[PDB]
Design a binder for this molecule. Structure first.
Ligand code: ATP
Ligand code: ATP
Ligand code: ATP
Lengths: 311, 311, 311
C-alpha cells in the first residue's frame, strides 16, 4: 500500500473560489487592524462538514509556520469553545492554546482576563480564529447563553484583535440576541457547499483538480457526465461524504492493485459510507438504478438549521 | 498601504453638536461637584453603536492625559459591568480599574467598600464613567436586579463623586424600578443618531468634515445629493455601519491605488458589510436600483428598545 | 466661579416647621431614655427626596460634633441597611459604622450580638438612626422579611436605647406584619412635602429664606406670584427637584455673570433637569405658556407608595 500514497490520497487539498474568498477575507481582516483602534472583525457561516477546519489549517500552514519557526510569537490561534460554554472556560482555553500552560488550576473570572489582556500584546497575537459556537445555543431548550458573547464583547473592547468566529448557520441567533454583538461582527461570508450537479462549473473543475491531485498516474477517472451525476446523487453538498467516497475508492483501487478507480470499488465504497445518510436517501451505485433528476435539487437555504428546527 | 494612512483613515473623529453637548455636560458635571456636598450626577442614553465609547475616549484623551502623565492621580475612570452584574463584581471592577490589583482574590462585599470609600479621596477622583447597564435587565425574564442600583445609591451616599452611567435607552427601566435612583440621576441626555437624509444639515457637514479628515488629497467625493442619500439608505442611524462602509471604501481605494473613493469600490464594500442588516433591508449599491423616499424615513423613537420588546 | 460661592449655593439649608418638629422629637426621644428602662422609640415616614438624610446630617452635625471632637464617644449612629437585609448584615453594618473594623471577616450571628451588647454601653451610644426600611420588602413579590425587625426587637430587649428607624412610608407594611414591633414604635411622624402653592404660607417663607441663603447680594428674585406657581408646577413636592433647579439656575447665573437668577436661565435649568419626570408632566418654563391651576393640585396621600403599588 505504502504510507506516502495513502497520506497523499487523504491530503489531496484543492481550493474552491469560496475558500479563496475566505482566505482573501482572512488576509484582509488581519492586514486591516493595526492593534490600536477597534478591529474590523468577521464571521463565517458554512454548514455541517464543508471544510471550515480545513480552511483554518490551510490558513495556519501558510501564515503561522515561519513565525512559529522563529520562536515564541504564534501570531494566530485555534480556539474551540466547550459544550454549554461559559466565559471562564473560553478564557481558560484562550490562555491554554496561547503558549502559557498555567492559569488553569484555580482561576474564577478575576485575574486571568487581566493577564490575558496584558500578555496578548506581549506574545504578539495579530488575529484570533475561534471555530465553535454551536454549543452556545442549548440542545433541548430554545435559550442561547449571552455571557460568552458579552465577555468576547468586553475583551474586544479592552484588547484590540480581529476575531473570525466560525459557527453553523443556526448560530446567527447567538448574534441576534445581543444588539452590538450583531453590530460589531459586520463583515460576513457563506462557505456553503456545491449547488449545481450538471457540470462545466465549480464541481467539475473541483473533481478534475482532485483527480489531478489523486495518486494514480493513469490520468482522471472522474469528470464524466455519467459518473459526476452519481457522485452528487451520493453526496448532495457535504464535501466530507464525497472525499470519504473518493478515499474509500482510492484505498480499494491500491488494494488488489488496479490502474484507476474504475466502476467496481465505488459500489463497495458507497455501501460502506452510507451510515450517516437518512433512510429516505437512496444509493445510486447499489444496483442497476438510473439516477433521477428530481433527487439532485440543490441543498436547502436552511442546510445547517436542522438541529435548531428539531425543537 | 502604509500604517499611518490606514491609522488616520480609521481614526477620523469629527464632533456632531450632540457629542459637543455631552462633552459640555460632562465638563459641567465634573466642575460642579466640590467632593463635599451631594453630587449633581448625569445619565447618557444613546443607542447600540452611535459613539458612546468614542465620546468617553475623546473626553478621557483631553482630560486624563496630563494628570496621568504627572503620576498616580487618575481623576476619571472607565467601568463596564459584567453580564447579570452583582455589587461584588461592580466594586471588584471599580478596584481592578483603580490601579491597585489587590482586593481581587478573596473579598465578599465586606472590606472592599470601606477601602474603596477610603482610597477614592486619597487618589483624587473628580468623576466616574460607568459604560454598560444593558446587563442589569435579564435576557429572557422581564425582571431587573436593583442590588447594583442600591450599591450605587449607597456608594454615592458614602463617598461624593459625579457618575455618568451610560446605557442603551431600554436601561431606563433600571432607574424606573428604584424611585430614589430615578430621582437621584436628574440630568439626562439623548446621543441619538442622525434623523434627516436630504442634506444641508448635520449629516451633510458631518460627511463634509469626514471627507476633510479622510487621507486622500484630491478633495471630497461625498456630501452630494446624488451620493449621500445612498449612504443614509445603507445606514439609517448607526454611525458604526456608515464609518465601516467609509473605512472599507477607503481601504479599497488605497489597494489598486486610486485618486478618490469613486463609485466602483462602494458596491463591494456595501456587499461586504451587509451581514448585520435585516433580511427586509435592501442594498441600494448592489445593482442599478434607485433609492426610494419611503425607505429614508427617520429612525423610530424606540431605536434601542428592540432587545427589551423581544420579551 | 469660585469654590466658596458654589459650596454655599449647594449648602443652602433652611428649616421647615416639619423639620423643627422632627429635630425636637428626636432630641426629646434621646433625652427621655436613660439606658436603663425600655426606650421610647420613634419612626419617620417622609417620601423619596424630601430631606430625611439632610435632617439626619443636621442632627448629627449639631449633636455628635462636640462629643466626637472630645474622643471615641459617638453618641448618635447612622445605618443604611443592605438590599434584601438580613440580621447578620445589619449587625455587620451597625458594628463597622461604630469604630471596630473587626467582627467583619468571619462572624455568623454568633458572637457579634454579645460583643455589640457588651461595648454599646462602654462607648456610650445615646440614640440609633437607621436610614432605609425599603430593603426588608422584596422588589418583585409583596412578601416582607421579618428577621431584621425580630432581631431589632431582640437587640432592643437586650440593649435598651432609642431607635429612630427612618424609611419611605409604605415601610409601615414591615411594622403592620409584626404586632410587637408595631407596639414598640408608637411615636410616628409624616415628613410630607409642600402641599399649598397659592402663596403667603410655608412655601413663600421657605423660598424667601432660601433666597436670603443664596449667594447673590442684591435681594430675592423668587417669592413672586408669577414665578412661585411655575416653580411649584415644575417640582410638586420633591424638594430635590426644586433645589436642583435653584442650583442649576444659580450656576447658569454665575456662569456668563448676571446680576441675579433671571427668567432666561430657568428655561435651560428646567430643560436640563427634565429626565426623572413622567411623560404626563408638562414643563412650564420651556415655552411662553400660562400654567394651569388644575396641574397645581396638592400631591396624593400615598405619595411614596407608587413602586409598592406597581405589584
Ligand atoms: N479544497 C478541498 N479539496 C479537497 N478536499 C477538501 C477541500 N476542502 C475541504 N476538503 C475536505 O473536506 C473535509 C472537511 O472536513 P472538516 O472537518 O474540515 O469540516 P468542518 O465543517 O470543519 O467539520 P468539523 O465539525 O469536523 O470541524 C476534509 O475531508 C477535507 O480534507
Ligand atoms: N464624530 C465622529 N466622527 C467620526 N467617527 C465617529 C465619530 N463619533 C463616533 N465615530 C465612530 O463611530 C463608532 C462608534 O463606536 P462605539 O464603540 O463608540 O459605539 P458604542 O455605541 O459605544 O457601542 P458598543 O460599546 O456597544 O460597541 C466608531 O467607529 C467611531 O470611530
Ligand atoms: N431646609 C432645607 N432648605 C433647603 N434645602 C433643603 C432643606 N432640607 C433639605 N434640603 C435639600 O433637599 C435635598 C434632600 O436630599 P436628601 O439626600 O436628604 O434626600 P432624601 O429625602 O433623604 O432621599 P434619599 O435618602 O432617598 O436620597 C438636598 O438637596 C438638601 O440640600
Amino acid at each position: 500500500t505504502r504510507e506516502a500514497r495513502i497520506s497523499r490520497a487523504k491530503r489531496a487539498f484543492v481550493s474552491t473560489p469560496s475558500v479563496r474568498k475566505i482566505l482573501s477575507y482572512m488576509d484582509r481582516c488581519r492586514d486591516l487592524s493595526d492593534l490600536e483602534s477597534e478591529p474590523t472583525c468577521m464571521m463565517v457561516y458554512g454548514a455541517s462538514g464543508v471544510g471550515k477546519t480545513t480552511v483554518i489549517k490551510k490558513y495556519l500552514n501558510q501564515n503561522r509556520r515561519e513565525s512559529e519557526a522563529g520562536g515564541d510569537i504564534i501570531p494566530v490561534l485555534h480556539i474551540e469553545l466547550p459544550d454549554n460554554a461559559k466565559p471562564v472556560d473560553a478564557a481558560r482555553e484562550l490562555l491554554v492554546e496561547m503558549g502559557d500552560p498555567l492559569a488553569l488550576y484555580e482561576t474564577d473570572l478575576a485575574r486571568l482576563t487581566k493577564r490575558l489582556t496584558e500578555l496578548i500584546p506581549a506574545v504578539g497575537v495579530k488575529l484570533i480564529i475561534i471555530d465553535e459556537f454551536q454549543h452556545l445555543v442549548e440542545e433541548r431548550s430554545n435559550r442561547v447563553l449571552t455571557q460568552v458573547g458579552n465577555w468576547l464583547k468586553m475583551i474586544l473592547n479592552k484588547t484590540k484583535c480581529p476575531i473570525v468566529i466560525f459557527g453553523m448557520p443556526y448560530s446567527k441567533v447567538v448574534l441576534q440576541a445581543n444588539s452590538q454583538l450583531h453590530g460589531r461582527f459586520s463583515i460576513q461570508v457563506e462557505l456553503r457547499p456545491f449547488s449545481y450537479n450538471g457540470g462545466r462549473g465549480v464541481f467539475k473543475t473541483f473533481l478534475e483538480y482532485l483527480d489531478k491531485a489523486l495518486p494514480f498516474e493513469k490520468q482522471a477517472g472522474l469528470a464524466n457526465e455519467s459518473l459526476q451525476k452519481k457522485l452528487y446523487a451520493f453526496s448532495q453538498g457535504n464535501m466530507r461524504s464525497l472525499r470519504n467516497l473518493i478515499y474509500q475508492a482510492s484505498i480499494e483501487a491500491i488494494d488488489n492493485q488496479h490502474e484507476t478507480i474504475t466502476e467496481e470499488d465505488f459500489v463497495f465504497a458507497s455501501k460502506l459510507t452510507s451510515g450517516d445518510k437518512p433512510n429516505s436517501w437512496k444509493n445510486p451505485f447499489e444496483e442497476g438504478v438510473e439516477v433521477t433528476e428530481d433527487m439532485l435539487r440543490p441543498p436547502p437555504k436552511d442546510i445547517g438549521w436542522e438541529d435548531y428546527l428539531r425543537h
